[PDB]
Amino acid sequence: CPRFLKVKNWETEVVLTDTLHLKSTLETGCTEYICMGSIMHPDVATKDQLFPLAKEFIDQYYSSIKRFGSKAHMERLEEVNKEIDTTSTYQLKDTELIYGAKHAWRNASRCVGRIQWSKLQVFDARDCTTAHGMFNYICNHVKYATNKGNLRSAITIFPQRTDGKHDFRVWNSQLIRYAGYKQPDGSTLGDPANVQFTEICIQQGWKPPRGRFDVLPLLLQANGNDPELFQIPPELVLEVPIRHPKFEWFKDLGLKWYGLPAVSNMLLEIGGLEFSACPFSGWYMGTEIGVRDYCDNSRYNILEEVAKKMNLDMRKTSSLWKDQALVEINIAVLYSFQSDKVTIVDHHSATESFIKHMENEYRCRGGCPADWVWIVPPMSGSITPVFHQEMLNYRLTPSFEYQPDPWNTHVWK
Amino acid sequence: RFLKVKNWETEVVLTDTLHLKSTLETGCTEYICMGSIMHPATKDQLFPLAKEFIDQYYSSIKRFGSKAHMERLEEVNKEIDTTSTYQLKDTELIYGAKHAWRNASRCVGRIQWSKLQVFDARDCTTAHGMFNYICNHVKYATNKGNLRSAITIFPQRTDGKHDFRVWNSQLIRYAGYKQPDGSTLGDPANVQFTEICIQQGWKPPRGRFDVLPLLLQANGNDPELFQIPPELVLEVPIRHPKFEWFKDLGLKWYGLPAVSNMLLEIGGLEFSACPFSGWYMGTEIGVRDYCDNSRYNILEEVAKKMNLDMRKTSSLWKDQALVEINIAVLYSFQSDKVTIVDHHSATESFIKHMENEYRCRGGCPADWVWIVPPMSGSITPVFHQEMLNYRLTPSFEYQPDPWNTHVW
């Protein structure tokens, strides 16, 4: 592979040079003959597999703190090595764990918000043993992160995988989500995305209110055991009713959303250790709710209903009645959130911030992996600075990975 | 391997077998992906390239291994042998150009690929002949508003020394003038080229929408200026359906989109001059041309007349300004019976086209980065459609700008 690579910005002619792609660890899916850049998704580790993985991470950590080749560095290596040799695994120091989680965020190519990567609160929950213990740690995460609307990014990290039969998993894809109920007539109430999971919850014992914005319970699995339901204290779930600064009728749509974006189905990998339960949270970009949650045809799909109340021509597609209703929904989402002092970033600010971030990364780190397909907002793309930015995408470790859905793999006791 | 693509909205899955047929590299490796990078012969090189092409021609017409097929291979062989190149049959020229359109991973219009009008201009020898050939393309392809797809093909490369090149990247584009005060009149994307025309003796009207003259190079010779007759250049006054103040903005665009700087490649032959044209997707003009900061840049101005709050980015004034600008663009073309496709319709057609391609051809290369409209992305059905990109041949490829390699 070639040493230096170039990326161009076609709006500013700025040309950056990427040396970091050389440290790529795993596969992208692409080959010389085919590219999978638009493809969404392209039993444990043995000793000899783990040794080099771990050393790589350690060396990396000691090169960050400017102690590479030091006495503490070589001594750490020998300790880690002795530990894999005898126990088939090892354990990360609190320092290593915190560096590793910040660095998996920093390396997350699909994430437009990584300018904040270094400010992340890491909650070590490796001492956990039960679902109640999990429910407790998560509740504290929610309360810390939410901070009364002044959100703060945090991760809570549960015990790492051992033999595969003793995983900790959060069964909810995200900590806070709205239920979805299939009707007998085929129509759906709530968030259609979450139907399968809502059914699981109901079978597992949940009594559903059967409403449009019913907050799902946590379903928590510890040490390989069957999952258990716990409801989140509603006082811990900050929520924003959606109104519009011009249209008085917009609140009549009875729309709200949750203030905390919190991913709980991804696997954090550090030094070859697998953290199968590692919920993290930040704050929302306006478009996530205004465009995807609200407007996607298979989600809340309110475009037609907002169009009606706007009195738009809806026969001709070229009237652009859809794009007009879309902008106005996203105007209301940013308005509601700012007026309740809940932290939220518009897609112009975020993309501008990210270009800044990327440039500093190229400067200081010799590169910054990025997934243009994910990075570019799902509305008004070309009018944001990232659209015109060339981005090399590759996978650096530590990283956040996808993992199978637990209800597909779990062995019921 | 077979590969699968899923649409995440409909959950439809398609199976790609076609990708097995490509050979050209994409740029990516198993470790680095360049899906967002814009720009990632001899007798012995020439024959197998020619052979594969003929093979798939005679396979597409269901006469594979025929006597017709066998002599063609023989004909082509003896010809490369004794001439270091070979000429395409007319049937093969037409197939090669339609199929190069068909393999254009970055084109959303490809549902139309087979209704391509093909203009053979391989008997051309001067810049004057080119100009006459181009005028005819423009005039046919414009057709009084009812746009039709066409391509014109000038003689193939031979030795690099005698290349045919249209120097305009597009047959019709507005001029760009640098001002003493730093700013730019006309089109800022064209400013260099405009000054190469002026340097060649073009008299610029120094205006915001001055059609640039043709700069044609024939057989490796110096380029020569030529004005397209105005009656062949259809343009549209851009006006708004509800905003009666919009016309006062002074916006017009040309009706005919026509890329003239690329390079058609068939059976290992290089047509360095092959202007093709179809019709516009509204966003091409409404978003990119008018609203990029390095283009016409009118969002500030429009949102002013629209009287929006322009103090904070989070009031999404740009996103409002943008939608109204694109409404006008569609409404102007439609009102003038000039062909245009909106991005909702062009995307639907594409998804339908993909279905067709998979169904009968086992795949359809697509560049998601380019296929997704530059506005309202996820409310079009292609945002949610997974696409595989790979380079099938014949293809349209890029080439060095002429003024970087030509000696006078």
Ligand code: HEM
């Ligand atoms: C601090 C505020 C943050 C903002 C504004 C932000 C922004 C975003 C956005 C808009 C997306 C796309 C979401 C989607 O389309 O589903 C995303 C994805 C992602 N973000 Fe962030 N993020 C933030 C914090 C974080 C943190 C704290 C982490 C990890 C520690 C993280 C890691 C990721 C990852 C791994 C993805 C990809 C998700 C997937 O593949 O499904 N982000 N981010």
Ligand code: HEM
């Ligand atoms: C007939 C109606 C057509 C429509 C609606 C259409 C639409 C589009 C659009 C919107 C783009 C993106 C270009 C940009 O944003 O810069 C594009 C690209 C492209 N189209 Fe089409 N097109 C049409 C006809 C054609 C024809 C006749 C050809 C060739 C025979 C063609 C081949 C291509 C190629 C090669 C690109 C890639 C441009 C590049 O790489 O710079 N298209 N098309």
Ligand SMILES: Cc1cc(N)nc(CCc2cc(F)cc(CCCN(C)C)c2)c1
């Ligand atoms: C950490 C973080 C910050 C931020 N601003 N946004 C996120 C994503 C939040 C989220 C919240 C949510 F409810 C669903 C999703 C993804 C749904 C599945 N995808 C693959 C189609 C994501 C995460």
Ligand SMILES: Cc1cc(N)nc(CCc2cc(F)cc(CCCN(C)C)c2)c1
């Ligand atoms: C054949 C065709 C059909 C159609 N609807 N649109 C096109 C492109 C028209 C066009 C016309 C034009 F003047 C410039 C461009 C893009 C120039 C390069 N970009 C990346 C900075 C494109 C071509």
Ligand SMILES: C[C@H](O)[C@H](O)[C@H]1CNc2nc(N)[nH]c(=O)c2N1
């Ligand atoms: C098929 C395609 O990859 C898929 O629809 C992607 C496109 N880009 C995206 N970008 C973001 N940020 N989030 C998404 O869910 C998607 N979806």
Ligand SMILES: C[C@H](O)[C@H](O)[C@H]1CNc2nc(N)[nH]c(=O)c2N1
């Ligand atoms: C860097 C990136 O490749 C560049 O901004 C691309 C993105 N997608 C595009 N898509 C179209 N249709 N036209 C373009 O010029 C671009 N530009």
Ligand SMILES: [Zn+2]
């Ligand atoms: Zn790729």
